[PDB]
Amino acid sequence: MQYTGSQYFGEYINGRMEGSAEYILPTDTRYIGEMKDGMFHGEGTLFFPSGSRFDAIWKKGLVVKGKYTFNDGLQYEDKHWHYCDSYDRRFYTEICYGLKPSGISQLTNMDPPRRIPLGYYDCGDGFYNPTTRVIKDYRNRFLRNADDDEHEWIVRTCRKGWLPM
Amino acid sequence: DLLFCEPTELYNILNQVSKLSRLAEPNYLCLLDVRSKRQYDESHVITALRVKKRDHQYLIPESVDLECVRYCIVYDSNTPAVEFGQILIHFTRQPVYVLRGGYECFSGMYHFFRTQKIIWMPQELDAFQPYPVEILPGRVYLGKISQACNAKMHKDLKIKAHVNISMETTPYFIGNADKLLHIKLEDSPDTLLFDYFRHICHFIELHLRLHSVVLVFSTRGISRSVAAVVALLMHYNEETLKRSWAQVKKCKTNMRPNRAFVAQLLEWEKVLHGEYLTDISEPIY
Amino acid sequence: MSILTSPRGKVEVVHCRRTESQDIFCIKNLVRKFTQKLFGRLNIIYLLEKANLAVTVCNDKEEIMAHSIFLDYPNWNVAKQDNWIPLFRELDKEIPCTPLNTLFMHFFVAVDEYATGCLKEIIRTVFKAVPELYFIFLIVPTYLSLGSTLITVFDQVGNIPCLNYNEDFAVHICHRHNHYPQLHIRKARVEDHDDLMPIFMHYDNTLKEIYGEYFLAELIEAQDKDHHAVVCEVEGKAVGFMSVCTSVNLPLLHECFDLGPFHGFCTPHPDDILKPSVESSHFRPLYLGDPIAFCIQLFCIDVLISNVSLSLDFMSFVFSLFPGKNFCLISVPHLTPEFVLIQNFVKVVPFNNCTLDHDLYVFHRAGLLRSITIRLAKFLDTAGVEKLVSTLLLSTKILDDLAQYNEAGRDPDGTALQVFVAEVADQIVGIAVIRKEMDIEYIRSHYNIEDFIYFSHHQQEEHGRLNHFALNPIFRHYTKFFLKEILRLGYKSCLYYPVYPQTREGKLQSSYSHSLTSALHYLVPVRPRRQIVYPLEKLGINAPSKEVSKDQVSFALNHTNRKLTLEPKVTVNARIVVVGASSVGISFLETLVFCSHLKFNNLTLISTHGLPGKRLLHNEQRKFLASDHCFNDKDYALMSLCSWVNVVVGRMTAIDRAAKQVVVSKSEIVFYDHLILCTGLQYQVPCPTGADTEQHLTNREVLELSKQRYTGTVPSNLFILNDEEDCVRMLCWLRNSSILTEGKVIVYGNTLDAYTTVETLLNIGMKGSGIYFVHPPTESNITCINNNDVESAVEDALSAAGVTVFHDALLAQWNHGQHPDPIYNACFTTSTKPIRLECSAFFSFYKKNVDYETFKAFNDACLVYDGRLVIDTTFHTNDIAIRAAGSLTKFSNRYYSNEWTHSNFSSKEIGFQLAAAMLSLFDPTLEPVTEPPADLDRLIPMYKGAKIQGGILPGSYHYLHISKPAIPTPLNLQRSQPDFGSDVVTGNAKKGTYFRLYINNYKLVEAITCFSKEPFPSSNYIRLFGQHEQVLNNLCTRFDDKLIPDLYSYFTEPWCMALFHDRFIDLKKELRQILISKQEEDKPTMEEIAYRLEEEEINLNEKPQKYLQRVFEDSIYKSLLEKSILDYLHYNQYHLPMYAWPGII
Amino acid sequence: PLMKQRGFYSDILSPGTLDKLGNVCCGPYMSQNLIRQADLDKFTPKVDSFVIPEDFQERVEQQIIGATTRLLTQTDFPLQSYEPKVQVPFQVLPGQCPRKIEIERRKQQYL
C-alpha cells in the first residue's frame, strides 16, 4: 500500500489479498474489483480521478475488457464512435433532451451565454490564444503550451474568444 | 547555487542523443513540477514526475540518486518552484538549474513534449526517437537523415527548407530550387566546401529574412553540417572561430568536422577577419 | 604503526590502510564547516568515485579518523584536466611538476589532537607509495591562511587567480624530501659491511653458513671492473646492498628465453639471424653480436619503507658504472615474491618448453629517463610510429587508424576515436588506440563491473574501451601511469577490454576480437553474471530493455578504472598446479582468476585435452553425455581461463613427490609448489565376465568376476566416452562408417548416460530395432532416476522405438572365446536363461572409476589410497604439500562416514571452498591461518550446494534432477515413511509435462525432479532449490487448494524473477542481518523471540506461526525489511523491469 | 608448509656452467596463457626500433633532489686521522676479520 499509495477494502488470506472489494490506486483512481492470489481476478469497474468509469476483467492477472463511460455518464465507443457527427451534430445532453429543456443558450457546450473572457478560445478544458500559444485552465491560470501544429489545429477547428460579432 | 537556463537548452538536452536517448539513464535528468496534479494530468515534461505536496511541505521524490543526477531542473508555469531550487542547492554535484520560462515559451515553441503519459518504461525510453535539434535559436534546426525524412518531425516544426552536404536522396522539396539547398559530396577532406559555405550562409540568411523554417543535416548530424555551422556563425556574427566552435560544442556534443575542414574554416576566419584569430594547435578542435 | 600522544598525554597507535567504503560513513561524520571552507560542497562519494587514491589512517581500537583524497589535477578549477603544466610553471619555472611526478590533495579531516600526527603519517604514507611524487600541491582561496595543522607541512608559493573571476587562490607546497628522503649512493667501503651484516642475517643464514661471517666484507673487497658493489646511506650509515656483474652466459639465455623483443641484449651484427627462413616454436634467434646486458646478483635493503623508492634510485648509479652496458638482468628463484626492486622489471617469457629453476626479469638504461610524456596524435607521429610498429601483427591496421584520426577527427562510422603517443627525449615509443563505449548497459548486465564502480555517479559519457595498445615494454612499468594520463586526457573514468574466445569462428578471428598487447597485466577480470530467462512474450514493453536482452558474440570482460591505477596488485610467482577438470576442477581455476587482489603468473593446468569446452559442437553432440548443467560453452567463454591459465595437453603419467615434479608421459616434466588433484571419476573398460553364458554358472560366481578389471586388448568397435572430444571422435567415425544406416548396437550400463546415448542415436537416425540396451542389477537398488512414473514413461518410449531392454543381465563374452576386435556377437547371462545378441558396436557406461593409469601413478606416489583417495576434511593428503578433492576422494575411516564423500555434493561448492582454503596460503591480505584443530578432524562439515544431473531422454524429452546431498534411499521408502516431507507434484511424465518437488517437514524445498518436452529454464529452477514454500508464494496452499494449474507456467509470473535474481539471495542475507539487529531496549530480536517460541521456552494455545506472524507485523522490524527490499528494488530495477518503489512513482 | 623468503639474489647467469640441468629445454611442449603471448614479440615492438636518446647528462639534469647525508656531514676533520692504531696484519687469514673492520669497530666503541 504505502510505498506507492494503493488502497484496498476487503479480505486477506495468508496476508495477500483475495476479495470482492472497492479499491483505490495511487493515480487516486477508484476501482471495484475481485482478487486472487494477491492479484485482481475479477470483473471490475475503475472509477477515474475524474470519476468516469473504465471496466477491467482479469485473466490470470491481466486485463481483457472493453467498456468506457464518461463522468457525465455519456456512453462511448472507442471505435466508429457515432456521436455529434454525420448522423446528428448534437451533444449528449442535446441528444437526450433534444432542445435543452428551456432552450437556454446551453444549446452549446457550456453556458449561460458569455464571451470567452481573456480572448483565447474554447476547446472545452481550457482557454488558448493563437496570438499567445498558451493554454489556460477555466480558473484562468494555465495549461500546456503549444507550437505550430496544435496552434494551427486550434486556429482552424475550434471557437476563438473573438469579439462577439 | 541556483542558475537560469534557456528553454532552447532544455530542447537540446532533453532530446540530446548519443546512440541512446539520454532519458534512458536517470542520473542524466530529474525534473519535478511542484504544482497541481491537475496541470500534470493535462501534461508535463517528457520525463517529469508529479511532485507530492503535503501540508505545504514537499515529499522528497528520491526516484533517482538525487546526490549526483548531473542535470537537475525545475519548472513552474512561468518564473512555488523557487524554494525547491533553494533546497536543491545542498544536493547535486553540479549546480542546479531553473528553466527560464518554465513552461510558457518552451512548449509554446515545442508543443510535442506535452503528453498525458507519465513514466516511460525503460524499454519505452530506450525506444525513444529524437526530434531534430535546434542550431540558430527558433530559426534553424539540425537533424539526421531519418529525422529529416520523418513525417511528423518535418511537419511539426512547420518546416520547409533543407540544407545538406551529402549524396543521399531525401523525400521532399525535390527540385524546389529556392526552398531546397542541397550539396553533394563525401565527408572527404579534399571536399573544398569553403566556397559552398558562402552560398549556404546566404541561403540560410535569406530564409531568416523570409522567416522560413530550416533544417540542416549531413546524413548523421556528423561533420559537414558542423563546419557549415561554424562558417554560418562566424559570418553571421563576425565572430571568431573559437566562439563559434564553443557554441557548436554544446549545440550537439557529437558535432565535429575534420582537420582539412578545420583548415577550410581557418581560411574562412582569415577571410572574414583578415587574419587567424583562433589557434588550431589545441586538441579542443 | 606509529605512536601519537595527544596534548592531553593520551597515547594512541595508528595504522594506514587503503580506504574501504564502510570507512566513508565514519569519515563523513568528521567533516566540519571549517573543512567546508577548504573543500565545501564536497560530497565524498563523487570525489572518491573519481579518486586516484583514497587513504585512511586508523587506531588499534578501530576508531577511524584520518583521511585524504588525492588526484592528478587541482581543486577549485585553478587549472584543468586538459592542462595545468604551463600555468604552474608560470608560478615557478623551477618546479618540475608534471603528471609523471605530481598529485594534488582535495580533502582531509581528523580529530585534531591525533589529527596533527595523522596528517604527517598520511603524507609519509603517500610519498612512500608513489616514489615519483616529489611534491604535493595545496591550494586555497587567498583569504585563507592554512593555519597550524597544514602549516606544519606546506609552504606558500606564488598565487593563481580563478580561471574565471577576480577571485584569487593561493598555492602551497610540500616536499617529499622533507617527509621522505631520497637515498645517498656511494661505492662500498669495508666499514659499510658491518651495518648491513645484521640485515642479511635477519633475511637469511644460508649464505653466511656457506661463506662464513665476513663474506659480505670479502665481497666488498673483491670489486673491480667486472664486479662493483654499492650501498645506500642514511644517518651516516648504510642499509642497502646491491651487487652487479658484467658476466652473462649468453648461450643459456638464448636457449631459454625468446629475446625476439630483446635483440638488444646482444649488439647488432649484420647477419641478424632473427627469424627462420611448429618449427617456429623450435626455432631460436641466432644473435651474433656481443653481450651488452649486465646482471644484478645480490640485493638486500631496509625505515624498511625507505627501500621502496630508493631501490629504483640504485639503478641510476648502477648504469653509471657500466658505460658499455644498457640492459640489467636478474633471475628470481621460484616462490620468492616480487619485492619492489624487481617490480619495475619486465618479466621475461621462457620458451615453449623451457623449465628453468628461475624466472627472469629485465630493466633497461632508458628507464632511468624521465622525459616520458603523452601527447595526442599529430602528423609527425606517423614516421615515429611507422618505425615503431614494424613488427606488430596489425601494424598496418594501427598505422591506418592513426593516420585516419589525424585526418578525420573520427572513426570511420563517426563515433569517438582517440589515439595517443608516448614521447621520450624528443623521441616516440608509445602507442594507444581507444574507443568510446555505448553498450555500457550491455556490459553491466553481463558482468559485475559494479564491483569496481558506483556506476550511477558515473555517466554514459564517461567510458573508454581499448582496442590497441603497444609499447616499449621498458616503459610498461610507467605504463600504469600511462593509463592514468589516458583516462585524464580522454575525460574517461573507465577503460574496458573484451577477451574474445580464442576458438573464434571456425576460421575467422572476427573483428570483435582485438589485438591485445601487454595491457592485460593491469586490468582486472570481472566475475560473470547470470541472466534470468525472460518470458518476453508475457512482458512486451515490460522486458529487460532489449539491448540488455540481446545475445552477443560471447566473450570475457577485463577492466581498469582510475582508482585502481595505483594498486601494485602484487604478483604471485608460486608454481601452483591443478590436475584435471572432469566434473569439477574448473571451479578452482575460477576463484584464482576472480580475485583482483592477486595476480597469478606460474599457474598451469594439466588435462587430457587441456581446457574444457574447446569445440564448436552442435547440440546433438551434447546429447551423448548426461550433464550437470553447471557449465556450458558460453560459461567457458566468459571464464576465459586461458587468458591467464597455462595449459598442457594429455593427462599426467607419474607423480614424483621428492622432486616435487609431475610427469607427462615421454619424460616431459612439470614442477609444482602446490599440487591440487582433481581428475574426477572417469569410466573404465566394461570388463567381460570371462565366465560365460556358454558356461551356465550361477550368477553370483559371475558377479564376483564382473568386479575385476579388464586387461585384454581393446575393441576398435567398443567405445568409452568421458568427454566431448571422445564424443566427436566417435561421431565422426560413425559418420564415416556404415553402422548408422543398418547396424545392431549395444549400449550397456544402467546409468542415465545410457538413456542419453540412446536418445542421441535416435536423433542421429538409427532405427530403434537397431538399438539394444542392457542394464545390470545394482549393488544398491536405487534406479538412476528414483522416479518410477518417469522411468515407466521412458520405458514406454523405448517400447515405441523398439529398443531392446534387458534387466538383470550380466555381460557374458562378446566373441565368446574368438578374437575380440571387432566385436560382432555377444552373450548375456540372466537369472534363468542364456541370451545372445548381435552387436555391430558396443557403448559402455558400466562403472565410473579412477583411471587405472592415474590410480597406479598415485600408488607409486605412496599417497594413501583406500580404493579411493584419502584426505582429511581440510583436503590435506599425507603430504602437507599435496591436497585433493572431488569424487575421487574419501576420508579416513575415523570419520566413520565412508558413505559420505565429495561425490555427494555440488562440484562448484567444492572447488570454491578448496580455493578459499588454498588462498589463505597464498594471500597476504588476509592473515596467515593455522593448521586445523583436531576438533575439525572430528567431522565432515555439512555443505549444501545442490548437486545437478540433467539429461535428454529417449523420445526427445528433457530431464533435470537436483538433490540435497544424501546417501541414496528409494523414493517409495522415503514416501511411505511419514517422518520426512510434504511433496509437491504436477505431472504426467508420458505427456511430457512433469514436475516433482519434495518439501521437508522444515517446509523448505530440498528436491527437484522434472521431466519435459520443453526447454526448461534450469538456471531459474536451480534457484528453487532450498526455497521455503513461503518464498514460493505460500506454494503449499497453491498445491493443496486446486490453485496451481501446473508449475512451469506459474513460474512465468514476474514476482518469481527476483527469487531467480542472484543479488536477491544476498539481500535475504541482509534481511536476516537486519532481524539480527536489536532495535529497542526491551526487545529480543525477532530471531530470539522465534527461538523461544519454537523451543517451548514459551508455550502457547495458538500454533507458533500465528503468534510469531502477529508479533512481527505488530513490530517495527517489518518496516525495516520492507524499506530494505524497496531499496534493493531501486538498485536492481536497472536489471529488473517489475519492482515497485518510489522511483516508479 | 611453504614459505616465500630467500636471500633474494640471482645465479643462473653465471658463465661457469650450462651444466647442472643438462637439457633445460626439456619440458612438455607449452601452450602458453594469452597474457604472455600478448607480451611476446609479435604483440610487442623490438628494442632496436626504439631510439637510443643522446645523453647521460639529460638523466642527471632530470634529477631533482638533495641526497640524504652529503652536506650536513661535512666537517674540517681529516678522516684517516680518526683511525686508532691496531696491530692486525694487512692480509688476515680467511675467517678472521679483515684489518679495516677492526679499525671501524674500535673507533665506534670509543665514540
Swiss-Prot record, chain A:
Gene Ontology cellular component terms for the protein in this record: sperm flagellum
SMART domains, sorted: MORN
Highest taxon of source: Eukaryota
Major site of localization recorded for this protein: other
Renumbered ranges of MORN repeats: 8-30, 31-53, 54-75
Record's keyword annotation contains Cell cycle: no
Tissues expressing the protein: Only detected in testis (at protein level).
Xref: InterPro entries: MORN (IPR003409), Morn5 (IPR042814)
Location of the protein in the cell: Cell projection, Cilium, Flagellum
Keywords: Cell projection, Cilium, Flagellum, Repeat
Short name of any one Pfam family annotated for the protein: MORN
PANTHER family: MORN REPEAT-CONTAINING PROTEIN 5 (PTHR46437:SF1)
Name of this chain's protein: MORN repeat-containing protein 5
Organism: Mus musculus (Mouse)
Curated annotation (Swiss-Prot), chain C:
Presence of keyword Cytoplasm: yes
Alphabetically ordered keywords of this record: Cell projection, Cilium, Cytoplasm, Cytoskeleton, Flagellum
Subcellular location: Cytoplasm, Cytoskeleton, Flagellum axoneme
Phenotype on disruption: CFAP61-null male mice are infertile. The epididymis contains fewer spermatozoa in the cauda and caput regions compared to wild-type animals, and spermatozoa exhibit short, bent, curled, thick or missing flagella, and are immobile. Acrosome morphology is normal. The length and motility of respiratory tract cilia is also normal.
GO CC entries: axoneme; motile cilium; radial spoke; radial spoke stalk; sperm flagellum
Source taxon at top rank: Eukaryota
Tissue spec. comment: Expressed in testis, brain and lung; the expression in testis is higher than that in other organs. Detected in spermatozoa in seminiferous tubules (at protein level). Not detected in the respiratory tract cilia.
Gene Ontology biological-process annotations: cilium movement; cilium organization; flagellated sperm motility; sperm flagellum assembly; spermatid nucleus elongation
Primary site of residence: cytoplasm
Function: Involved in sperm flagellum assembly. Plays an essential role in the formation of the radial spokes in flagellum axoneme.
Subunit structure: Component of axonemal radial spokes, the protein complexes that link the outer microtubule doublets with the central pair of microtubules. Interacts with CFAP91/MAATS1, ODAD2/ARMC4, RSPH3A, ROPN1, ROPN1L and RSPH9. Interacts with DYNLT1, DYNC1I2 and TUBB3. Interacts with WDR35, IFT22 and IFT81.
Designated name of the protein: Cilia- and flagella-associated protein 61
UniProtKB/Swiss-Prot annotation, chain D:
Effect of loss of the gene: Mice are viable and show no malformations; however, homozygous males are infertile, due to inability of spermatozoa to move from the uterus into the oviduct. Spermatozoa show decreased motility. In addition, tracheal beating frequency is reduced.
Subunit structure: Consists of at least two heavy chains and a number of intermediate and light chains.
Top-level taxon of the source organism: Eukaryota
Entry's localization field: Cytoplasm, Cytoskeleton, Cilium axoneme; Cell projection, Cilium, Flagellum
The protein's name: Dynein axonemal heavy chain 1
Entry similarity comment: Belongs to the dynein heavy chain family.
Protein's job: Force generating protein of cilia required for sperm flagellum motility. Produces force towards the minus ends of microtubules. Dynein has ATPase activity; the force-producing power stroke is thought to occur on release of ADP. Required in spermatozoa for the formation of the inner dynein arms and biogenesis of the axoneme.
